[PDB]
Amino acid sequence: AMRQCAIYGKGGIGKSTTTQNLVAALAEMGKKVMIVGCDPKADSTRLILHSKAQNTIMEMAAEAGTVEDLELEDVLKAGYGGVKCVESGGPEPGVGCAGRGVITAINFLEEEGAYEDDLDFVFYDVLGDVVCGGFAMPIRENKAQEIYIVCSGEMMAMYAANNISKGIVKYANSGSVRLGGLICNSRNTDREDELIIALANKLGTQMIHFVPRDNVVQRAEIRRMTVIEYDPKAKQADEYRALARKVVDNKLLVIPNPITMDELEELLMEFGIMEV
Amino acid sequence: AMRQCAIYGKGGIGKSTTTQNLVAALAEMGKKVMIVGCDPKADSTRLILHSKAQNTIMEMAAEAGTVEDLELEDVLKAGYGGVKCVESGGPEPGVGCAGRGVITAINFLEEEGAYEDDLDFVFYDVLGDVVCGGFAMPIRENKAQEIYIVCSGEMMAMYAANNISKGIVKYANSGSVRLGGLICNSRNTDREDELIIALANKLGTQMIHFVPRDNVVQRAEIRRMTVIEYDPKAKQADEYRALARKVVDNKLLVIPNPITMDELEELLMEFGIMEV
Ligand SMILES: Nc1ncnc2c1ncn2[C@@H]1O[C@H](COP(=O)(O)OP(=O)(O)O)[C@@H](O)[C@H]1O
C-alpha cells in the first residue's frame, strides 16, 4: 500500500519548504517517498536534490522528441534519504494553460510504473491559487486521496484553503479524494494557532500541525537543504518530525464543509488578527 | 483619451487595497475612473462601494438568462468619488477555467459602451499567480496598455512580477501593452525598497512607489472604506496620493527584460533579505 497525498495552498505560503522537510523526516524514519512537483515554479525538489532545481518533464520531453521517448529511469532523481523527485513543468507565461504539464507528468509516471509497490508515500506539491486545469487534476482524477492545505492567518491563505475545499466537494461523488488537514505555517501573529484550529473545525478537518516561523529555514535553503539534513538538532527539525509523525498516524479524511466569506471574516475578527 | 491600466501581482500581495486606494486618490484629484475586477475573489470594488463585495457579471448574467440580456446601467455601480465598479466573477473551484469570466466581462463592457469618452482611467485588478486564460487576456488582447505590478521583497512576489513581465514580452509583437512600474507593498523588511528598485532596473522599469505597511489599512477596511475616505489626514492617505500623482505623471512604459532565477536569487542575497 502507498498513500497518495497532495500539498495545496496559495503561492508563497510554504508548500515546498513544508513538503520537502516533511518528506525528509519521513525518509529519516525509514519511509520510501516520491515528490511530484506540480507548480510551474518548478523548485519543489531542489532541497532534496541539493540542486538549483530539477529539469522538468516538459523540458525533457521537448529535448527527447515526445514524452513517450523519455525513460522513467532518466527522469526520476533521488536525493536525501533516497527520496525520489520529479518536476512537471508548464508552459511559459502567456502561452496555453499553466497547469498542462501536471497532466502530462502524472500520466507519464503512472504509465511508466513509477508507483512501485515499495513506495510508502507520494506527495504532489500543487499550485493552489486557482483550482482548474492540471492544478485541479489530482482532485478531479482521484490521484491524491489525502489533501493537506498549508495556510496561515492571512485572509488570502484561508480563502485559498476554502477554495481547495470547494474543489474537493465538487468531485466527491466519485473517487476518494478527501481533506486530511490544515498545516498552519506561522506568520508570528497572536492567536494564529487558534484561528487555524477554528477554521479547520468549521471545514470539518483538523489543524494537523502548527509550523513555527524559523530563520533556520532560510539558512538551510541558502545551502539547498532541508532543515532535517542541514541541522538535524534544530528545533525546527523536530517540528517537521512532529508533522511527519502526525501525517503518518492521521486517520481523519473528510469531505469538507466550505464556509462563506462571512464566516471567514468572522473568524478573522474573532481572533483579533486584523487588530494585532 | 483614457489610460487603460492593469494591476497584477501574486495573491494577497495588495492589489485590491492598492488599486482602490490609488483610484480613490485619483477621484479626489478630479479624475473619472472605472475599476474592473478580474480576480475570482471578487472583492476588488468593496471599498469603493462600502459593500461586502459586488455581484459579478457571471452571477448577473446567470440570473438574467444571457450576458446579452444584461443592461450596462444595471451592472456598473458607482461609489466613493463617483468611481465606477464592476466585477467579472468566475467559475467555482474545480469547474472550468478560473479566468473565463474575465473574458466575458471585458467583452461585455466594450460592446455596451462602458469605455465612455469622459473616463480618464480604467484599472483592471487581475490575478497574477498564473498568466493564462482570462488572466492573460488583458495582455494578450491589448486591453491594458500600462501594467503596474504590486510586489514585495518576498521571493514569490518577485517571481510573479518576472512571470507577468514574460507575458508582456510574449505579446509585444502587436498591440501596445507595456510594463509601467513596480509598486512595492512593504513587508517592513530592511532594504526592501532598494531590492525592488534593483529588480525594476533589471527589468527595465522603475519602482513607482514604496507603499508602507500601515495598520490604518485594516482599520479602514473593517469599515469597508479606502484609507482616502476613512481618514483623509492619515499618513498612509498621503502615500496613496503620492502613488496616484506618479501614475498620472508616468511616461516610462517599456517592453521589460525578464531575468533568470539566478538573477532573482542574487538580488535576494545582495540585499540581505533572507538574512534579516
Ligand atoms: N516555517 C518557515 N519559517 C521560515 N521561513 C519559511 C517557512 N516556511 C517557508 N518559509 C520560506 O517562505 C518562502 C516560501 O516558501 P515555499 O515553500 O517556497 O512556498 P510555496 O512553495 O508555497 O510557493 C521560502 O523562502 C521559504 O524559505
Ligand SMILES: Nc1ncnc2c1ncn2[C@@H]1O[C@H](COP(=O)(O)OP(=O)(O)O)[C@@H](O)[C@H]1O
Ligand atoms: N500597505 C498595507 N498596509 C497594511 N495592510 C495592507 C497593505 N496592503 C494590503 N494590506 C492588507 O493585505 C491584505 C491583502 O491585500 P489585497 O489588496 O486584498 O491583496 P490581493 O488583492 O493582491 O489579493 C488585506 O488584508 C489588506 O488589508
Ligand SMILES: [Mg+2]
Ligand atoms: Mg513551491
Ligand SMILES: [Mg+2]
Ligand atoms: Mg484582490
